Amino acid sequence: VVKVKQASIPAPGSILSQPNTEQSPAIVLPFQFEATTFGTAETAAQVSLQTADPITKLTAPYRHAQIVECKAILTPTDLAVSNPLTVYLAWVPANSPATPTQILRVYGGQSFVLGGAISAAKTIEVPLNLDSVNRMLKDSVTYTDTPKLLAYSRAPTNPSKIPTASIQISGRIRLSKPMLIAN
Amino acid sequence: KQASIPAPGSILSQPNTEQSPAIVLPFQFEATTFGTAETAAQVSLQTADPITKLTAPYRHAQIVECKAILTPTDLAVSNPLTVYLAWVPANSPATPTQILRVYGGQSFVLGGAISAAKTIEVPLNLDSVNRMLKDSVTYTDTPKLLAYSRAPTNPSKIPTASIQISGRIRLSKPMLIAN
Amino acid sequence: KQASIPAPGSILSQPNTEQSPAIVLPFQFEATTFGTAETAAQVSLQTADPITKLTAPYRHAQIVECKAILTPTDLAVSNPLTVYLAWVPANSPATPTQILRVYGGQSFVLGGAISAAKTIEVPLNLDSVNRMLKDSVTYTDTPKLLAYSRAPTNPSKIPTASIQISGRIRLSKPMLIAN
Amino acid sequence: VVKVKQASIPAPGSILSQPNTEQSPAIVLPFQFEATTFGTAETAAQVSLQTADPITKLTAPYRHAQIVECKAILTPTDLAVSNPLTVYLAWVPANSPATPTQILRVYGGQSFVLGGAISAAKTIEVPLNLDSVNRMLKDSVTYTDTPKLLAYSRAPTNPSKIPTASIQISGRIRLSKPMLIAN
Amino acid sequence: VVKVKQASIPAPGSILSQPNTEQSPAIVLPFQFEATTFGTAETAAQVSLQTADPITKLTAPYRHAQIVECKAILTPTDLAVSNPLTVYLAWVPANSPATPTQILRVYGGQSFVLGGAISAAKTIEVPLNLDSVNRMLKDSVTYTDTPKLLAYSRAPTNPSKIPTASIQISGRIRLSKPMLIAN
Amino acid sequence: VVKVKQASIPAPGSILSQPNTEQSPAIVLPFQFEATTFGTAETAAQVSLQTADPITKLTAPYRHAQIVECKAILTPTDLAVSNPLTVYLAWVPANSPATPTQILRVYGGQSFVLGGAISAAKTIEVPLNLDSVNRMLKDSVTYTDTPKLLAYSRAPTNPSKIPTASIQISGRIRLSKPMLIAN
Amino acid sequence: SPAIVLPFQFEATTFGTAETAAQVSLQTADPITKLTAPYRHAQIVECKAILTPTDLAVSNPLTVYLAWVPANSPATPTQILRVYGGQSFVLGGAISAAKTIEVPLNLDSVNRMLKDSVTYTDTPKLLAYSRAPTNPSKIPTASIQISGRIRLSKPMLIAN
Amino acid sequence: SPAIVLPFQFEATTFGTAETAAQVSLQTADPITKLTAPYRHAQIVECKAILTPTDLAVSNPLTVYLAWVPANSPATPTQILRVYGGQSFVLGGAISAAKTIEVPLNLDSVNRMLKDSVTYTDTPKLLAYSRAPTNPSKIPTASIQISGRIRLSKPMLIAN
């Protein structure tokens, strides 16, 4: 049921120039897809909003598109109150040596819990502070300061054949300046 | 409390004559049950017997304050479960199995996990859908709620939780009928 | 049009809180039939299924405009009949057989007698009885209509005339119930 | 030779929005067709100005069309002064459980006569009070608050092979915003 | 240790007239009696402040008497932390089809818990919102808009021979305009 | 359905003196009883509001009582449209040689009809013009200027065993200054 | 409108022959009703319950109890007296000539409106009780009749 | 806060069967108490001690003495009468129908506050005495009941 800010450092990414003062109107669409599962085995991935299968299915139809707000959720599962674990979230520019394992020796990386008859277990939001990266996603000239989510883990002791936790992550993007595509 | 975006449905207008004052009648009913088995419920207000018995008699029906309630039972205390949930327009190809693959997705558990033994209030910002419900025509921005829960690892015989829905509505333009 | 006297019934009052706006729902129904045989009907609104189906759902019920209708049929044109009639408080020991031995008594015929083939409107000046109908308590100044007609000299198989009653009422303080 | 108002209740029907302030001009055409016959046998019908064979033959050629005034006449016939009967008019939104038989236990339903050496027998107009329904007939988005006439009867004792009474009903509609149709 | 409002709807009940401006003085007496026990077996009752054995033992000696504030408490018992259960409170006018079982499909009905090693277990107050009913209890002319408490349950799995929870309910009444009675 | 004034002549009757300016309050009660039947045979009576069985049953309980308005109705019966007749109403002070037969050679006496396939047949009111008599009914000192209704008839040709017409007559009296009576 | 005052009196009930003990309500009380029906509303004013010794009495005397109580009130016709406003006397060779007995009905105890639009239950009720032991003659021992005036208005369609 | 007035009446004690003579205190008086417990403070207002002859009496009459005295006061139920404010009557064939007897309790003699925060001893006490010689029937000869109104306030946590 709560939010927790990832400490970040001012390093906005240099963007593309600009027209008159927003040549073409745009639209604000929201989105929320599935990041990754846990508990089935050692899970350690890294997603880039850039090549986010879902994400593009929406960016696809346009040339210009930037994000406005992006969240990082942690939905815990029914079980887990019995087979707890740990996650290592950390927001960072896809441009970096950071790797799931060291998701600690970075900066904002935080360690958690979820489960156990101790804690209470309730959603955990960790907002991506964009002032730390380049907000534009699809643009005329690809960048490398794209937001990429880290978070990793350690293999479980009692692997369930079902998830133990979701990393569903949502937000809002601004697709603009049309595309062409197929049909 | 679910997140949303400004998605108001546009409805027809009234001519300058005058309308019959309404009543603001309230309601609340059982939508679905949890703990028996894989429960993928989809429920749209525009068609819930319960509220209809309250629409049939009039012509102009409008919803006012609607809240979705979630309530556990002396069960979960021992063998919990997870439930998905979210308010959506009867149009979305939303399949309760994706209850969270769509913006505004809400997920939480209840049962043997410290303070999971509580009541959950999550309403719909009726500015996300069509305030109306039964007009001269039929809209589609009708609010249709949906939720889901895995096939319980260990089934019970009785529910582990309700999800009663409650509200109030302005009903006017009284239907001319057979007494 | 029946004659009357100022006979208003006193009813309880409302505390300074605020009441739920009402709806003004209308109605109209078959009260009794004529031509089959000696018909001595007594009918009180406070207990006519027809209007109840419209009171049950609320708590505060008040009548507004009530008219008593009399209507002949293609019958009378050939074998008439006489009918008595009058609006009275459910208290009077009025026996329809005395429909006219009590002030305000109305009597007229219809059928084979020049212009007897017409519709008769005679309403009740609800200032002769209790405006109310279903309150927190139960009054007796409830309007109870009554009429009568001799045992027809030559019976028919179908009615010679209706007497449908029509009206409208303010219904408020909506009953809290099981949806 | 006379009019008789059907008591009604304010419940105008919600219509379709609107353009600038009457995008396209229109025209006011009148009409008057045959409703139903009586006396030949038990007659009990229900007509909806909506699917009024005649009516459409005129609405057909347009997209937008609303009524302005609509009357309900009762022309009695030569006979009848000998084989009287009864009719049960009642105006109501085609959207309702009302059925010819109960044309009484409704609201405005009225009972009549016509015939007999008693009464005088002369036309009877019963104006449809539109404030009670939706006036628009053919529109971009069909409604269900259409005016539908009720009126019913009981079978006669002496069935004539010719009518005993007409229910000719007229009025005026405003067809506008063109159609396309065949030729 | 806490309060929880039952959502209600404005429908105050019509009372009896009045004298000069409080003909006779009165007094404010408080009260607090036992509602019902739980856990011994399937418990589902309905009490009406009207025929509340205790209550009258106090209203008895007067003609005029109205309530001022009325509470609905839920005292949990020592056990229960082991044999949890559920209650279905709901305040409503004794004039209604509401029955313990459906204490849900009503309006303000709420479901609870008490017990289990999860929750904390502490008193639960649920204030009767009088604006929803008739406050006068004993009056010259009996009413039917009396407050009646609902709340029901389901039979327990492990029936203890001792209670699992109290529904002690208190408040304050204003008895006035004397009676006569026996001695 | 109508009224018809009986021509009268100013001759109010001298009443009893008076107290302060209405010593005691009074009340206005209405009444309406059955006068006489017709058609069963030759009917010719004369009623005096004074000894009107019904009337007194109401005047009985008081010492002072005067009339305010008094009507004379003529309700025709179902039949009669076949066996017409004639009535001879006439209002006059019970103090007079007037007798049912000569109800014509008086003054206001009027002749009527009722029935026949010709006329329409509808109630007939004939208001008693009190300025013509003494309005006080029961008083400390009996008068003789009491209103007495006349009206008579001729025996019918086809005597029915049931009435052919009512002479129900109503009005309003003012009983005041209490009595004593039995219980 | 304005009401009018009206008097009345009626044999209440004979506490004389056998063990007499009963309750009388003014609302059902035939006499009264048969006098109020004409009006659609009536408030009671002055009211007294009287007591009358019969010629005999001095032979086989007795004692009767009286008491005024509202409609309800668990007044036990026997537990009478234990109720405030209850009294008792004997009869015969004991003050049977210094202006009757006479027991008054206080108004600020109950309520009037013998019959209005509703059906109040604060209407007066009278209680008595004897035991009529010794020798029960077939002739009364006492009257107990009731009297008073009563306001009433708002005319009301009736029989005639 | 404000109190309310309340009435009561109760069979005091039967000076009828055998030699009756006793003292009754209003403070212990069950009836009363069982009516005051609800409040934490009550001042008495109007109070009278009544006398009632029983049907019999006229057979084997008797005489009773009454007297009102504060808590203390060496009032000897027998030395009664010799105390100011004491009276005595006989019964039967001697005024048994001209409105009972009725003996009033003066207030400016004792004190009220039947039960306050303390335990005053100026509370009223009633005295009587007969001797019931001749033929002691097993049936009472007289009532002596007590009535009155009583103020009372300051609510007080109770049974329910």
Swiss-Prot record, chains A, D, E, F:
Gene Ontology terms: cellular component: T=3 icosahedral viral capsid
Major localization class: virion
Cellular location(s): Virion
Pfam family, one: Tymo_coat
GO MF entries: structural molecule activity
Record's keyword terms, sorted: Capsid protein, T=3 icosahedral capsid protein, Virion
InterPro entries, sorted: Tymo_coat, Viral_coat
Superkingdom field: Viruses
Gene3D superfamilies, sorted: 2.60.120.20
Family: Belongs to the tymoviruses capsid protein family.
Stated role: Self-assembles to form a T=3 icosahedral capsid composed of 180 copies of the capsid protein. The capsid encapsulates the single-stranded RNA genome.
Protein name: Capsid protein
